[PDB]
Design a protein around this ligand. Sequence first.
Ligand code: HEM
Ligand SMILES: COc1cc(F)c(-n2cc([C@H](O)c3c(C4CC4)ncc4cncn34)nn2)cc1F
Length: 386
Amino acid sequence: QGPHMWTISKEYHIDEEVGFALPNPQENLPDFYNDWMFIAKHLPDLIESGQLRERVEKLNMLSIDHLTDHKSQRLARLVLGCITMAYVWGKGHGDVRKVLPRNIAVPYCQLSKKLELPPILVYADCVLANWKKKDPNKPLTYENMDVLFSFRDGDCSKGFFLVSLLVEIAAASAIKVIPTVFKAMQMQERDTLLKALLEIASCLEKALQVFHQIHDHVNPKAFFSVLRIYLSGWKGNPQLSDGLVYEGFWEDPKEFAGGSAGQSSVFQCFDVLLGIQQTAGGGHAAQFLQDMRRYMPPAHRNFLCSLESNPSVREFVLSKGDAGLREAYDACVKALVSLRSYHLQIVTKYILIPASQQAKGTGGTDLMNFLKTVRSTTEKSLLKEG
Ligand code: HEM
Ligand SMILES: COc1cc(F)c(-n2cc([C@H](O)c3c(C4CC4)ncc4cncn34)nn2)cc1F
């Protein structure tokens, strides 16, 4: 019949409440994995004391066969991924391990192959599956939430991961409007389309207000001098120029990029929907965002290329000579420009200024240039405002 997004199929694994985030993540693994759980839950103490690497090297190789459902496999990825970052970087002062012991590398790679995700911590692990409600009968607010794992005391990982998650959830409230958009275009329902675009804009405007909470829960000194170390990967990294050896799984060292919000499917989703061709051309920013799709869960990666197969919303609006429809489309693009402009100020506070008192991103190239290119591509998609 063809690529028609008239409904969001349950096979895309997009939750009605939390969107691309993992709904009600599992907190405990079966008892068989207690040795992994003790290490993952005590990374601040084990790293600070210099005992982390020895505790990891003492592990027996545990089979992944006892992780029988999706949520336990996602929790185990988050546990193994946090342990791997702590093992590779240690205290973060130049003494790096270039070989991941087989006792963790083998189950980590087996589980990563099973979930079609690389054997490195991704945004879907440390943001989308790394959370819980303190009280299940209370709403999804910062006060009623916590992360499952942190790297070091005072690293601000709770604030950084949770505010990223909250923004991600706020933007997700617009996903349910996508089938209304495609259906209104197919059925030539102008008023329905206009109303749907304004609702998407409203959601993206609310996501910016949610972002303001970053200042209360993250401090620049801790983010840049402490958390930054554990967010780093091994692709174009001079500290691990050939990548990491996953002992017992692969013969040669392998390179994988560190976790990135370029792996967020909700932001890539609205750029695709609005025809902001962030992945077009052969430039660095476009190549990076396309590359980050292979670091997203497979159903979410599938949702994005499915959106790309649908008719263009931008081309539909551009061809109508309808001021009301063009304004509603621009309200969506404007809300993304506003988010990106505010995020540039956040990056200046949390990265640029601390770095100046001491910038390359996950892609190995200047992060300010990447962000400004992404923002500029969005601003240039406005049909009028200039
Ligand atoms: C302490 C605050 C923050 C800092 C320092 C920060 C830093 C960065 C950096 C360095 C990048 C470039 C990509 C990379 O190198 O991995 C990036 C991209 C991005 N960030 Fe953040 N970020 C912050 C907060 C947030 C929050 C709360 C969100 C909400 C989900 C967010 C969403 C994004 C998105 C979607 C991108 C991809 C580029 C774009 O779509 O404009 N960031 N961020
Ligand atoms: C030179 O100094 C630095 C360079 C940097 F690249 C970073 N860095 C990288 C990320 C990453 O993209 C990220 C993540 C990941 C954990 C998955 N999660 C949420 C998020 C929101 N926006 C970005 N997010 N955030 N900061 C930090 C640095 F200090």
